[PDB]
Predict the structure of endothiapepsin.
Amino acid sequence: STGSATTTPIDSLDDAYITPVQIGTPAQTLNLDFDTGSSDLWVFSSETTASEVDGQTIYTPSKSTTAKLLSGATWSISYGDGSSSSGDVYTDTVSVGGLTVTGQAVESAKKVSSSFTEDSTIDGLLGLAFSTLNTVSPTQQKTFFDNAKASLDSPVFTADLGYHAPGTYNFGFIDTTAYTGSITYTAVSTKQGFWEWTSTGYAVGSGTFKSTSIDGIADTGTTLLYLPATVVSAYWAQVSGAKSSSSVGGYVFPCSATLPSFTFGVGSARIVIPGDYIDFGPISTGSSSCFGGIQSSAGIGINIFGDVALKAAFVVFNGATTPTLGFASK
């Protein structure tokens, strides 16, 4: 089997991407944030504290003839950005882009943190990291991809995120029309539960490529590109007037600037992030100071190849017995 679904930016800055997901019978379609950095499929629901729902579409398990409460199971997750959610668990039928999994754990939120409430466009998350990170207790549950894997034509999914435009998540096949040149594959460590890999270096603008190993994660659920302070400093030094602002929480730059591109290495291959992808707009409405899309990972504890990087590529998440990651230009 295969599936193919369009993923759409939630706003004009590409802060996150939503993908429609059918849950239950009859289908209840929710728009979920596909997150290769976590492993829980959780939804706003009829059980979510009412004051914590503000415009989201909810899953109502009582209206699904295939929903079953997973007795005794609870979940609770805290994300890198400080947000969180928790609740109980159903199993139900879940379909993405025509690919159906029966018996998928659907984690129903009883509580969500303010950042989720305030984002009316995201109805929940669909985790695509390794199932070892799943938070369900006392019996850990499998991700949608893990459940689907054996039925797929090939045990892969691909992320093709757009810049200010829709893109695609495919399951079970590689669309050879969706990229240019070749896909370069690189080793993955699953030791921390992530799609963790080592970039071979970087360049800023038209500058020379610096060969240096950068270990990090491919994370569709993180907006920005978080890299070591040395790398980030080298990038922003090429932007007149750019500075790190403790009050704002990262590098800012004059909105009148033209940003240089940023290149990252995948083996001997190179992915070029255009400068415009690195512009996250005014820090506050009407400001002429703009927020940078490349930020330091110092004190995150890990480098993160978030949407800023991934949307410059066609990315293969290869879930073979030994997982790997593939990147192509597009």
The two ends are 25 Å apart (CA to CA). Helices lie at 114-118, 144-148, 229-236, 307-310. The CA atoms of residues 244 and 281 lie 15 Å apart.
